[PDB]
Design a protein around this ligand. Structure first.
Ligand SMILES: *[C@@H]1O[C@H](CO)[C@@H](O[C@H]2O[C@H](C)[C@@H](N[C@H]3CC(CO)[C@@H](O)[C@H](O)[C@H]3O)[C@H](O)[C@H]2O)[C@H](O)[C@H]1O
Ligand SMILES: *[C@@H]1O[C@H](CO)[C@@H](O[C@H]2O[C@H](C)[C@@H](N[C@H]3CC(CO)[C@@H](O)[C@H](O)[C@H]3O)[C@H](O)[C@H]2O)[C@H](O)[C@H]1O
Ligand SMILES: OC[C@H]1O[C@H](O)[C@H](O)[C@@H](O)[C@@H]1O
Ligand SMILES: OC[C@H]1O[C@H](O)[C@H](O)[C@@H](O)[C@@H]1O
Ligand SMILES: OC[C@H]1O[C@H](O)[C@H](O)[C@@H](O)[C@@H]1O
Ligand SMILES: OC[C@H]1O[C@H](O)[C@H](O)[C@@H](O)[C@@H]1O
Lengths: 715, 714
C-alpha cells in the first residue's frame, strides 16, 4: 500500500527520445513522444518474469508533447515496455488501448518477437464490429520487451576509414541476406551461420575481398515481425520488409542474442568489414510498419499516438491510406515522425557506422495526402543535414500508389534503382528488338533519365536481378513464376518477368539448353559490368543461386533461399567469370565515369569519346538510331574522355569496341578502322584462333546471343 | 592562357563557401546558384581592390552548386563572385555580371559598401527604373569576402558545455556592442565599442556585479548602412539589415577585419564564458539589406533572385514585403532553408553562441502567403541535433498581414511578451485594467503560453527594449522626439504608453525628479517580481536617455552611447536594480518552471497563490473582472509544485506583493499573519511602522507605490 511517489524518482529529460543509460546519475532516462495520450505508464520487467511488470512507474512529467521520467538504479540490460492511455474512438482515428503493452519506438534493442495471440489487437477479433470494438485482454506476455543498452563500443581501426573511401563512381554493390548468406556455410561453426557475426568472418570477408565487390547492401535489419497470416501457414518473414522498430537490429540474426547482443553483434560486423575496406549499405523500410491496417495488431505506434505516425483517410480517419501495399503508410508529414526517421538515420550512421541506405519504396516517403512531392519537408531536412549530407542515399524510385513512379525525380545526392535498365536489358537479350536508342542510352548510364536533373551516371544503379523477382539463374531458367511454396495459390509475384527458359522450364539435361543459359548468364554479366553507371550484383548470382523459379521468395526461410556453396564444374567456372569481369570493370576508368559521354570530338582530338556503329561498318544515323535492333556496337575512346580526377588530371583509358548481339541467329559485323585484340566474350567454346584479332576494317561472324569486347591496340 | 592554363582542382560541393584546406595547400570555393549560366571567381590583393588580381571561371558543377579548388591560396585571401545569367526583371531574373557580389557564405567580410550608382544593376536615372540593365563595373565599390582560418583554442570553455544557465533562472541583458563600451574611458579606445572591449575585465566585473546571467547582443551579422541614411550624414546603428549571415560586423572589431572580426568575436565569447555568462545574439534572417527592386545588387539578388527572395507570384519582378524593409527571404527554398540553418549551426558550434532571439520571427514562418507555424524550416530546426539544445527566443510577429503570432510559436521557443510590456506600462501610467489582466501578466501570462503547453519561463517579460523608449525616457516623455532621424518625425511608434511624470524631458522640479525615480523602481520591481524570464534593457540601470528619441536606430552617437558618468541619483538606482536582481535570483518562487494553481497543494491549508482586495476579503468573481488600480497577492513559498532535476520539491519564503498604481493614497488590510517589509519603491526613509505589519492591521500606501512583504510568523 504505497504511492507512485513513495518511489525515488526524477523528472528526467525530453531528449533524447527513448531510454538512456546515464552513467553519472546511476539511472535511466525514459523519453516517449505522444501528443494525444492522456496518461503513460513505464513498465519494468525482469529477466525471468516477463508476463507481468516487476514494477509500474507512471510517467507524470511532460515537456510539450513528450512524457519523460528518470528512474534511479536502472542500468543497461533492463527490460521495459509502455502502456498508453487515451481516447478510444476508431471512427475518429483514436485507438488508445491501455491494456495493450507497447514497444518503445526508440528502443535500440528488442527482446524476442511476438507470440501471436488474439490479445495483441486491441479490438475483439471474432467480433462482427471488428476494429470498431475495444478488446481489454492484457497482452504483456506476448509482446517482446524493449531493452535499455550500453552504447559504448570501441571502433578499433574505426576512425581512419573515414576518409577517401569508395566513391559511388568506382563502387560495385553486392546485395546480401545476412542469414541466407551463411546459413549453409559449414565452413563456419554453426550458430554464427546466418548471423551478423557470420557475415563478417575471415572466411566470408576473404570471399568478398576475392569476389571484388566494394560495398555490401544488407537486406532489412530493422527488427521486424512475422505477419500472422504467414505464421498461420507454417511460414516466416524471411526478407524482413515489415519493420516494427527503426533503431533496433533484428534479433534473429544475432549470435549473442537478443538482449543487447544484437547491436553489439552488429557493430563488430561493420567494424570487421571496414577493416577490410568494405562499405555497408542497409535496406531501409520507412514507408510502412508491421502494424498493417485496421484489423491489424496494436504493438507500438498505433497505441502510443495513432493520429500521428500513420496516414489516415482524411474523410474517415478510421482507415489507413496505403501507398505501400502493406496495410498502412508512415505519416512522413508529422514533425515527430520526420524527426524519428531522421534520428534513426543519424543513429545508424554515427552509432552503427552504416555508410549508406537503400530506401525501399522511396516514393512513399514523398507522399502528402494523395500527391507525391519530391520537395516535401522530410527530404529537404535530410538534404541540409550535416551528418546525412555525407552518406550514400539510394532509392526505389517508386511506390505502388497512383502516380508513384518517381524515376529521375529524386534530389541530388540520390542514386536511384534503374528499373528501365533492368527491364530493357532483360528484354534485349531475351530476343525483343528495341530501338537502337533505348539500349545505347541504357548502355551509357541512361543520360535521358537523369541528365534532365543534373545527375550523373552514378545516380543510375544498374542491375539485371534482385531479391525482387528472379535470380540470374532463374532468369534464364523459367518463363513463368513458380511461387506455389508461398501458400498463396501462386497468386503473388510479378507476372511479366521478361524472362526466358532457353527452351524449357526448370532444371534440364539437354546440353544445348544448359549451354544457352550459361551463355546468357555471361551476356547479362558482360553488359552490367560494361554499362556506364553503378552496377549491382545480386548476392549469389556468382554461385548461380536458384530459388526454383520462385520470383517472390519473401517468406521462404529455408533451402530455397539459403546460399548453396557446393559448387560443381559449371556453377564454379562461372564464379571465375564474374570475378574476372568485375576486375575488368574496376581496372578501367572508361566505365566508372563521373561525366556522361557526349557524341563528339573533345580536346581537339580526331576521334569521338564514343561512337555507335551498325552491323556493317557504319556510324548510326537519325533513322537507324530510332529504329529497333538486336545488335548494338559501340566504341569508347579511352583517351578522348572528359574525365578529371580530384587532382585535376584528365584520365585516359584504352579504346574499346563492345559488340552486343541479342539476335537469335548469327551475324557478320564489319570492324571499324584499326586493330582489335579480343578481351572477354560469351563463348564457352575454345575461342577460334581467327577471332583473337581483327584488322583492316574486315569482318567476322558472330553466333546469336553473344557479347564481345575488343581493345584497339593499333590505329 | 585560358582558364585551364593555371592549376586547378574540380573541388567539392559541400560545404558551402570558401574553406581553407591545409593538407591540399589551397582553398575550396563553393556557391549555390540554380539559374546562373556562368560563374567567375575574383581574387583581389590587399593593396589593389579596384580590379581583380585574377579571374577564375568556376566550370565544375554538382547539381545546383558551383565549386572550384584553387591551389596556392591561403586564409586571408580576398575574393568575390560574378554571376552570369539571363536578365528578365519582369520574370524575376535579375542577373548582372557587371556587379561584383559578396559570397553569401563569407565567414568574414572586409569593409562595407562605398555607396554609388554603379552597384544597382539597373540604371539609377533611367525612366523605366528596375527594368533597365546598368553595365558599370561595381567592383571598386563592393567589400571583398575573406577566406578565414577557422582554428581557435577555446580554453576552458568546453565545460559550460556541461550545464549552463537554465531558462528558469535566466536574466537577460540586451546590449549594443558599440554603445556599451564606446563612451568607456576606462579602457583604451581602439577597443571602445568593440567585441574585445565588451569582454574586457572591467566590463565582465561590472556584469557580474549587476548580476545578469546572459547578454543579448543587437545584430552582429555584417550589415550595410542604408543609402537613404548615408545621404543624411547618418548610419545604421542597430544593424537590423545584413547581407551576410555568417560573418560578424567588421565595424565592431578591434583587430581590423581581414579575419580580425572573427578572431576578435570568439575571444569575447570565450571570456564571457569563463565568467559564466551566456551569449545570445539578436539575429535577422527574415530580410536582406538589398531592399526591394530599385535596391542594390550586392549578394543575393545577383547570385540567384528567384531563389533567395519571396517574389510576387503574379509578377516576380516585385518583392513580397512582410518585414517592411523592401524584401523578404523565402524560407521555402531548400537551399535558403539550408543557409539559415547552416548559419545557426555555425554560430553555435563555431562561435559558441548559446542561443538566438529572432527578429520578426513570424516572417520566418511565411510560406506561401501566410504564417504556417508548421513550415519546413521550423521543423528541420526542431529535429536538429545541435540547435536542439540552444535557446530560441522570438519576436512573435511581423509587419505583415495577420502576422501577429503571439503564443503560436513552437516549443523550446520562448517569446518576447509584448502584452506584458504594454499592460504593465499602462498599469503604472494610470489606466485601470481588469484585475485579471495584470494578474495574468504576473503569473507568467498563462492565459497565453499555457494553451500551447508552454512554461512560465517561455514568457520573456520586459518593460523596455531597443524598440521605443528606454526606462529613463519611459517616465520622462509622453511624445516621441525622433526629429534627429530626419524623417519629419514620422518614424517610431506613436503610442508609447509612457508618462512624462509631469514634464516633457529633463526638469528641475524635484516633485518631478522624484515621481520619476518612484516610477523607475515601480517598473523595476514588477518586472523582477513576475513569473517568467525578465529582460533588462542595457543601460537602464545606468538611467540611460536617448533624449526622448524612441527609435534611435540610426543614431550612432552620444544619444545612444552608454553614459557611464553617474551622479547620486544614478548610483542610487544602479544600486537598487542590483539589490532587486539579487532578490529575484535568491527566491525560487519567481524562477518557476510551472504555473501557480489557484488552489491548495500537498494537503496544506494555505494555497500556493492568492489575490486580495483593498480589504482582507479574497478576490471574488466580479472583482476579478472589474478594472483596478491596485493589485495584491500572496505567494506561498512552502506549497509550490516546483521540482528540481533531482526530484526535490523546492519551497521558498511566503511573500505579499502590493502594487498600487493608483495616483492617490490607499489603505490596505494585510491578511492574518505577521509581516515584514523587504523592498518598496519609496525614495524617502521608510517609517518604522511600515517595517512590520501584524494582525489584519492596516497601512497607508502612497499612490504609485510597489511593496514586497515577507510573513515572518503566522
Ligand atoms: C520494398 O517494399 C515492399 C513492401 O514492404 C516489399 O514487399 C514484399 O514483401 C511484402 C511482405 C509482400 N506483401 C504482400 C503479400 C501478399 C500476397 O503475396 C499479401 O497477402 C500481403 O497482405 C501483402 O502485404 C510483397 O508482395 C512483397 O513484394 C519489397 O520486397 C521491398 O523491396
Ligand atoms: C526587428 O526588425 C526590424 C526591421 O529589420 C528593425 O527595424 C528598425 O531598423 C530598420 C532599419 C528601420 N527601417 C525603416 C525606416 C524608415 C523610416 O523610419 C524607412 O525609410 C525605411 O525604408 C524602413 O526600412 C525600422 O523602422 C526600425 O524600427 C527592429 O529594430 C528589430 O527589432
Ligand atoms: O506499383 C508497383 C510497381 O511500380 C513500378 O511500375 C515499378 O517499376 C514496378 O517494379 C513495381 O512493381
Ligand atoms: O507507370 C509505370 C511506367 O512509367 C513510365 O511510363 C515508364 O517509362 C515505364 O517504364 C513504367 O513502367
Ligand atoms: O508589426 C510590428 C508591431 O506589431 C505589434 O503592433 C507590436 O505590439 C509592435 O511592438 C510591433 O512593432
Ligand atoms: O497594433 C497592435 C495590435 O495589432 C493587432 O490588432 C494584434 O492582434 C493586437 O494584439 C496588437 O496589439
Amino acid at each position: 500500500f504505497f504511492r507512485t511517489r513513495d518511489r525515488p524518482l526524477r523528472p528526467g529529460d525530453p531528449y533524447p527520445l527513448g531510454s538512456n543509460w546515464i552513467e553519472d546519475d546511476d539511472g535511466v532516462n525514459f523519453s516517449l513522444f505522444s501528443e494525444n495520450a492522456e496518461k503513460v505508464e513505464l513498465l519494468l520487467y525482469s529477466l525471468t518474469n516477463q508476463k507481468y511488470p516487476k514494477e509500474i512507474i507512471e510517467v507524470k512529467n511532460k515537456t510539450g508533447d513528450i512524457w519523460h521520467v528518470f528512474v534511479p538504479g536502472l542500468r543497461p540490460g533492463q527490460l521495459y515496455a509502455y502502456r498508453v492511455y487515451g481516447p478510444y474512438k476508431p471512427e475518429l482515428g483514436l485507438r488508445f488501448n491501455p491494456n495493450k503493452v507497447l514497444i518503445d519506438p526508440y528502443a535500440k534493442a528488442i527482446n524476442g518477437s511476438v507470440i501471436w495471440n488474439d490479445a495483441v489487437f486491441g479490438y475483439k477479433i471474432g467480433d462482427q464490429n471488428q476494429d470498431l470494438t475495444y478488446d481489454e485482454r492484457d497482452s504483456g506476455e506476448y509482446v517482446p520487451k524493449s531493452v535499455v543498452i550500453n552504447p559504448y563500443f570501441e571502433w578499433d581501426d574505426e576512425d581512419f576509414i573515414k576518409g577517401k573511401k569508395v566513391p559511388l563512381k568506382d563502387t560495385v554493390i553486392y546485395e546480401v541476406h545476412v542469414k541466407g548468406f551463411t546459413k549453409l556455410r559449414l565452413d563456419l561453426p554453426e550458430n554464427i551461420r546466418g548471423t551478423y557475426e557470420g557475415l563478417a568472418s575471415e572466411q566470408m570477408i576473404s570471399y568478398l575481398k576475392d569476389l571484388g565487390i566494394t560495398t555490401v547492401e544488407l537486406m532489412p535489419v530493422f527488427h521486424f515481425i512475422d505477419q500472422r497470416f504467414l505464421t498461420d501457414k507454417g511460414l516466416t518473414n524471411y526478407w524482413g520488409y515489415d519493420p516494427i522498430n527503426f533503431f533496433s537490429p533484428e534479433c534473429r540474426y544475432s549470435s549473442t542474442g537478443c538482449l543487447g547482443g544484437q547491436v553489439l553483434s552488429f557493430k563488430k560486423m561493420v567494424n570487421e568489414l571496414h577493416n577490410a575496406g568494405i562499405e555497408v549499405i542497409i535496406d531501409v523500410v520507412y514507408n510502412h510498419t508491421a502494424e498493417g491496417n485496421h484489423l491489424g495488431p496494436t504493438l507500438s505506434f498505433r497505441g502510443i499516438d495513432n493520429t500521428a505516425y500513420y496516414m489516415l483517410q482524411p474523410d474517415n480517419k478510421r482507415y489507413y491510406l496505403d501507398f505501400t501495399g502493406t496495410g498502412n503508410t508512415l505519416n512522413l508529414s508529422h514533425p515527430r515522425v520526420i524527426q524519428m526517421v531522421l534520428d534513426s538515420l543519424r543513429y545508424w550512421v554515427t552509432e552503427m557506422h552504416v555508410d549508406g541506405f537503400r530506401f525501399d519504396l522511396a516514393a512513399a516517403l514523398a507522399r502528402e495526402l494523395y500527391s507525391v512531392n519530391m520537395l516535401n519537408t522530410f527530404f529537404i531536412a535530410l538534404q541540409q543535414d550535416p551528418i546525412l549530407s555525407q552518406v550514400k542515399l539510394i532509392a526505389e524510385p517508386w511506390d505502388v500508389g497512383q502516380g508513384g513512379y518517381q524515376v529521375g525525380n529524386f534530389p541530388y545526392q540520390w542514386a536511384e534503382w534503374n528499373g528501365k535498365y533492368r527491364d530493357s536489358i532483360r528484354r534485349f537479350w531475351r530476343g525483343e528488338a528495341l530501338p537502337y536508342s533505348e539500349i545505347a542510352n541504357r548502355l551509357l548510364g541512361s543520360p535521358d533519365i537523369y541528365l534532365g536533373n543534373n545527375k550523373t551516371p552514378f545516380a543510375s544503379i544498374n542491375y539485371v536481378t534482385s531479391h525482387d523477382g528472379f535470380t540470374l539463374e532463374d532468369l534464364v531458367s523459367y518463363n513463368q513464376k513458380h511461387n506455389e511454396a508461398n501458400g498463396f495459390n501462386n497468386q503473388d509475384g510479378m507476372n511479366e518477368n521478361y524472362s526466358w527458359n532457353c527452351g524449357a522450364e526448370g532444371p534440364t539435361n539437354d546440353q544445348n539448353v544448359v549451354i544457352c543459359r550459361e551463355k546468357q548468364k555471361r551476356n547479362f554479366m558482360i553488359t552490367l559490368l560494361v554499362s556506364q553507371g553503378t552496377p549491382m550484383i545480386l548476392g549469389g548470382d556468382e554461385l548461380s543461386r536458384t530459388q526454383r523459379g520462385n520470383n517472390n521468395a519473401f517468406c521462404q526461410d529455408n533451402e530455397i533461399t539459403w546460399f548453396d556453396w557446393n559448387l560443381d564444374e559449371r556453377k564454379s567456372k562461372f564464379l571465375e567469370f564474374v570475378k574476372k569481369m568485375i576486375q575488368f570493370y574496376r581496372a578501367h576508368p572508361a566505365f566508372r565515369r563521373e561525366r556522361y559521354f557526349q557524341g563528339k570530338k573533345l580536346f581537339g582530338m580526331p576521334l569521338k569519346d564514343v561512337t555507335f556503329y551498325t552491323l556493317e561498318g557504319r556510324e548510326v544515323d537519325e533513322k537507324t538510331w530510332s529504329s529497333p535492333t538486336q545488335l548494338v556496337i559501340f566504341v569508347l575512346e579511352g583517351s578522348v574522355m572528359d574525365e578529371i580526377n580530384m587532382y585535376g588530371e584528365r584520365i585516359a583509358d584504352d579504346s574499346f569496341l563492345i559488340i552486343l548481339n541479342a539476335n537469335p541467329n548469327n551475324v557478320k559485323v564489319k570492324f571499324p578502322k584499326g586493330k582489335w585484340e579480343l578481351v572477354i566474350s560469351s563463348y564457352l567454346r575454345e575461342i577460334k584462333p581467327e577471332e583473337r584479332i581483327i584488322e583492316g576494317e574486315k569482318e567476322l561472324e558472330i553466333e546469336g546471343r553473344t557479347a564481345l569486347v575488343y581493345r584497339r591496340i593499333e590505329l
